[PDB]
Amino acid sequence: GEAPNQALLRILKETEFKKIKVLGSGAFGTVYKGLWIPEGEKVKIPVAIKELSPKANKEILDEAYVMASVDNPHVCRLLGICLTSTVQLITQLMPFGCLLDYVREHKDNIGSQYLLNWCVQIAKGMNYLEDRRLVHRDLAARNVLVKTPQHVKITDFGLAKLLGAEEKEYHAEGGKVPIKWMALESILHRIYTHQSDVWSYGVTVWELMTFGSKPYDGIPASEISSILEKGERLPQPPICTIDVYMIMVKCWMIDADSRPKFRELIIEFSKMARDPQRYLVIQGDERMMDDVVDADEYL
Ligand SMILES: Cc1cc2cc(n1)-c1cnn(C)c1OCCC[C@@H](C)CN1/C(=N/C2=O)Nc2ccc(CN3CCN(C)CC3)cc21
């Protein structure tokens, strides 16, 4: 049926690391900044170190499995794991943080060119996950990280599921789920596909085009299903021409097969990125150590 996953899982010694400071803490757990210094290789690699009990070790290992199986410039790659008391996920340090916080903080300095390139890059990442038969199930602006303002990558595979065999849906059970980003069929029937990731892509783009507004702000999660059933959608962001908003609305069709595919999202946003100010109208757009090696260059 499917192909052998010959990915390599790299077990990193704790002595090869230097935790430097806490970057973030919350529901996921704790993320740290640090430096990885492999073996006697004269190299220092900036890394993010993530900790989430046997349940915690199981779930972080499921995440390590997925991240070790992806290799794409717009997906965060696993560097390895450290087998301490609690299992640590070691990944590439993304120095500018999550894109949600980035657009909120740099609102008045984000031009149409960046907004549309980010849409292209996120869609490339998602189309790659689709190539690997991976449904993310948690695409959102908080889960896109900023390597540089010109280069973003999808992260957080804690909900990601590998469609096997010839299966097309992933039928989930209970568990906390981000209601305001999920397709209507996911809310109602807990069915997840690449096309339900497309819906979340549309909410993510809306997050970017509003400079980090909260979807359905004020509405609790339990009415989302009924609001969506009435035909109500997120509103048109002020900077968005009808060309861009129409793309988002198509991501929110009831019929999942009517939504655009990620490879078509790449094409459309890529055409719009060639003439950004024809598609987004933003005020003032036109005026907007020695041995360190980035993980993307340590192969
Ligand atoms: C490959 C990779 C890299 C990284 C994380 C993950 N994966 C990952 C995977 N699953 N999950 C849940 C993950 O964590 C995401 C949640 C926290 C994150 C924003 C922290 N964070 C960070 N994360 C990673 O590098 N880099 C950061 C650089 C700077 C700052 C300072 N703030 C910036 C914005 N404002 C608020 C000022 C303060 C915070 C940073």
Ligand SMILES: [Cl-]
């Ligand atoms: Cl939510």
